């Protein structure tokens, strides 16, 4: 199949004459078993049946199961016939250290140049100026820790010189909130990728059991810094408020206006490709 | 006076959707009908009635929302004529 | 509304609320016989200005006043309209209205969705929650002068009667009850005929003597 | 589920989908008249796996389908004591559902105060809120082959019906409907037996030869 | 004669979207403008060129496409009201 | 009684009784669907001689034969009347009836004035009678065949159906039993058009094949 | 509070048999459901709506009516155990369980 | 372990009510109190006891028979209330408490 379903509404799914039935309250849709590819649920009041799920082991469609924090928990398994997917963790379990520290550095290139720039769109000049000569400074191994660097001249640019991301507040709290959506979406798109999320590109640091999705959410980490600089005065209620609202808002892709999911999807389709084919092209994300 | 009201928005998100959904009951419920999609139209009594309506409507309309309002007289409201649905090569089969 | 019978000279014309006292008890139970059995006899002759004489079916007769069913499928029918009306008549009610039934068809759309079952509705409306509430009007602990003032407020509800008479209920309520329920008759512009054997003291009234002459009486 | 006449020699079992054809013009009407007369007539009987009689009550007899209405009286009272029954099973929803009907029920009772005629009412339950909104399953079926479908799934809903039966039902659909009929019903487990004058060519049936000797085909 | 033209038509469908740009095209190409979203309108030179505009729109309706056609005045055309989706001063009065 | 539809080339007629055999299995389920829902669909089209478009409450629609419900209101009143009718016709019959009759109400009334209450009554006639009798159709016992044939009998009864169709009715009876149903259609003079996938054979009929040709067939 | 409703009244007249219909009508109506005979239980959201159903309660109790009840945990409801002359199976500590057949 | 205990059975026939009383006699030699008709409770040492109280009164329960078996606590049982249409004192907010003479 090409399309892949997925279910952000409450809604039952039935089997029908080789034809899936989906009933949501506002409207019932009908759709080809060809014609689904990957299917996911993203909420947990969604309803399916066994038959359903018969029907989608004899078509091989992956079926991804997601909990209330919309993370992805589990995944049906069949005993034959399996997806490709599984066929294609071997690749990953192949990643080369040199293709890893090359997406890694475009990565952490990537984050720190939008830095850069939101702090030039804040008319910052020093400040962004620094960040960029980090950005032109960075280098592989990361022996001079200029992310690290960056990082505090970014913070204490946006907040303040008193703010810090140890500190306990109502900023650093949205801060993780908005890394949690983000970490939410980018690992749901590795869990579509059907690679494990459990091997990082970051090779020092393997605590972290979403160290792939949250080395692939790094780029657009700073989209959040702005609405908490913006709404850092609100509550941390109307701080979630305000990021709940990312999802409804589009943003710029390099190619067109887009939807934050498609760029998404997009650019972690293009790092499992290019991390598959050992570095065809690396997909560079800009504020 | 007869009102033709033209009703469109990006139907994409769910809470786009959402709106459509409740802005046509609302037009449903304030007398309009429905000759198509996004295609509706109202008998309004006099001036007064068609402006409180262009208020009401202005003040319901959802977001990204876009109405067009076209006065019409009533016999020209009848005469609205709605029709539903030059080639080298007609084909009658599969189109290939 | 001008009723006529043999006995009288003219034509009587029945305006708002009308007290007719027949002093004999003859021409009195004949006279209600007649309007009992209307509908054959020939001899009391009731007609509006356009002279056209009215059917049964338009008259309202009642004798027994707690005896009588004011609810009914039409007035109950009627007044639900009227209440629909009533809520109608203010934007902001409505509003409040539509908001609560649109969050409860949620509630209940989202339980069929929960269902294995393919479900359909189409809408809870104003007329089907009144109709769900059971309004209706309560007879059962009424005093008689509220019977008879319900009988008066459902008359307007009534369309296919075009007189209500009423017959020797004039000796249950008080003067001051009588003066309240002709005050009501003159705002509510229906047409009542009162029917007793004795004069009442204190209200406009046509009195009929043994003699058969038929006399106004201020008193 | 088993089925057993005078003119078998052992009792058949029909387990999932089932065709049974009837070669015979006179055993297929005269069994049809069993059918329908089941209640009346002891010549046609129906075993289950304990071996135990069923009442007609229980058999569901289905000729014409576009002509069997899926909205009954019996059907709507069990999906209204269904909805009433999940409603009563989360104690919060069921809270709130009462609190606006308290409030709606006061917005009312004001207005019938402001009148001037006296009001007398009762209260506003769910059932009257689920009667009053038109619950009931989809009526919209485009073709024979959809309404049938429907007519499995609120069989398969309903638990009294322990075996569904259609008489010459498979003349209407094609052969790949009567393939996705049959593995529809293998997939919902219910208990579906048919009966066809005639043999359909591509499916598994038990022919019942005019010698009155049944054999399986296919 | 003005004439307002509403074109509708589910989208869902590849072929039924081609079917809508090509429509669409089709209703530019004659001269139509279009306002808004399914909102259209063209002005006609007499009541010969509206028929001959009336059968050629019935043509080329695609499949399952729906128009509503509308005469209007221009006074009426000028008293067009579109709103896409609260003053703290009313003035009741001269305007000043 | 002309019918017509999409795939026929031209409108065919169907006098006394018709045997049409459609042998592929998507015209026949798309016309019995446009049977059902004859009303709503413009597609098959079922005009008189007047060509006036018969309205789908006088099209008169069986699938389930045993299923029909042949007792009603409207065709047991009209068979009471019927009944009358016969028994009018004779005159001798007519007469002991009215003995007996007689008798039973000069033995009831004497009862009545044994009473202590003064008792009046009318009479007792012989729709009454039939009526106390509770004369009706039994199909409780009936064979598919007779069932069918009771329906031909009680179509003359149903005014407002103006043509009888049958859908796949003809798979139950046999070759001989068909040959008894339109000999007596003939005699009926009904309107009836049976509707059958597969061709049944020795009896005049006219067959759609899968090309969406349509031929008359003897056998 | 899980709300445990026995319910036991002489049933020999037709007004007790009329009355005992109302009455588990009426249990029926406010959210109560029936175990079994005489058996009934209902989810009360706190303590207060408790009160209300305990006033309701003896309000709407028939002549000759007696209603014992008791007040129970999730965990104590989760243990009750129906044996009808066949115990439930959910005070069975048995390791396999089939809903099915037992074969 | 509070086990309460309710008892129900079609008592028309005399065999069964010859074995309503003899299981009723049952449950009294086996430590078991009436509070009311159908009803009774027994104080159980721990969860063995119960076991084998359970399989006893499977064992014993009359053919038609029908027990249901609840667990709880005492401050559960001091909970219970038991309304006669007069109820049990326990459930009552009173704050003088005559047990004499009511005056
Ligand atoms: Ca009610
Ligand atoms: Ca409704
Ligand atoms: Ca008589
Ligand atoms: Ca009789």
New binding site residues.
């Given amino acids: 199949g090409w399309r892949t379903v997925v279910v952000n509404i409450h809604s039952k799914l039935s089997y029908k004459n080789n034809h899936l039935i989906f009933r949501n309250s506002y409207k019932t849709e009908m759709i080809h078993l060809s014609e689904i590819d990957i299917l996911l649920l993203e909420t947990t009041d969604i309803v399916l049946t066994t038959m359903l799920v018969k029907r989608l082991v004899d078509e091989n469609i992956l079926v991804i199961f997601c909990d209330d924090k919309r993370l992805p928990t589990a995944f049906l398994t069949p005993y034959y016939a399996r997806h490709d997917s599984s066929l294609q963790i071997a690749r990953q379990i192949a990643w080369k250290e040199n293709v890893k520290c090359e997406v890694w550095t475009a990565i952490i290139a990537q984050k720190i140049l939008n830095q850069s720039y939101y702090l030039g769109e804040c008319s910052f000049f020093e400040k962004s100026q620094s960040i960029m000569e980090l950005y032109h400074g960075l280098e592989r191994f990361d022996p001079s820790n200029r992310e690290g660097h960056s990082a505090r001249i970014y913070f204490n640019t946006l907040f303040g010189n008193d703010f810090t991301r140890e500190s306990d507040n109502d900023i650093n709290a949205a801060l993780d909130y908005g890394y949690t959506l983000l970490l939410s979406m980018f690992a749901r798109e590795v869990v579509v990728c059907g690679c494990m999320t459990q091997i990082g590109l970051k090779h020092a640091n393997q605590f972290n059991q979403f160290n792939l999705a949250s080395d692939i959410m790094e780029p657009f980490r700073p989209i959040i810094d702005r609405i908490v600089y913006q709404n850092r005065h609100n509550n941390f209620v109307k701080i979630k408020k305000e990021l709940f609202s990312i999802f409804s808002e589009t943003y710029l892709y390099n190619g067109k206006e887009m939807y934050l999911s498609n760029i998404v999807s997009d650019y972690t389709k293009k790092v499992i490709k290019a991390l598959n084919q050992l570095g065809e092209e690396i997909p560079e994300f800009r504020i | 006076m007869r009102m033709i009201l033209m009703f469109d928005m990006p139907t994409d998100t769910a809470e786009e959707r959402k709106a459509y959904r409740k802005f046509r009951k609302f037009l449903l419920s304030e007398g309009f009908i429905m000759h198509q999609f996004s295609v509706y139209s109202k008998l309004l009594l006099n001036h007064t009635a068609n402006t409180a309506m262009v208020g009401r409507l202005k003040a319901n309309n959802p977001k990204k929302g876009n109405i067009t309002i076209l006065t019409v007289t009533e016999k020209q409201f009848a005469r609205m004529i709605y029709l539903y649905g030059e080639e080298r090569l007609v084909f009658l089969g599969d189109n290939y | 509304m001008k009723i006529n019978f043999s006995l009288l000279d003219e034509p009587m014309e029945v305006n708002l609320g009308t007290v007719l006292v027949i002093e004999d008890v003859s021409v009195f139970a004949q006279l209600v016989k007649e309007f009992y059995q209307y509908d054959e006899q020939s001899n009391l002759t009731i007609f509006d200005s356009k002279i056209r004489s009215i059917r049964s079916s338009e008259l309202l007769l009642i004798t027994d006043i707690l005896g009588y069913d004011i609810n009914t499928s039409q007035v109950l029918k009627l007044l639900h309209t009227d209440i629909v009306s009533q809520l109608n008549d203010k934007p902001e009610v409505r509003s409040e209205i539509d908001s609560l039934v649109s969050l409860i068809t949620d509630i209940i759309m989202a339980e069929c969705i929960e269902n294995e079952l393919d479900i359909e509705?189409?809408?809870?409306?104003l007329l089907?929650l009144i109709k769900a509430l059971g309004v209706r009007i309560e007879t059962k602990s009424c005093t008689v002068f509220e019977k008879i003032f319900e009988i008066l407020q459902i008359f307007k509800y009534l369309v296919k009667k075009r007189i209500l008479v009423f017959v020797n209920s004039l000796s249950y309520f008080s003067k001051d009850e009588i003066y309240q329920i002709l005050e009501y008759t003159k705002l509510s512009q229906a047409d009542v005929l009162f029917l007793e054997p004795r004069q009442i003291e204190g209200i406009q009234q046509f009195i009929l003597d043994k003699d058969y002459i038929l006399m106004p009486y201020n008193n």
């Fill in positions: 509705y189409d809408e809870i409306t089907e």
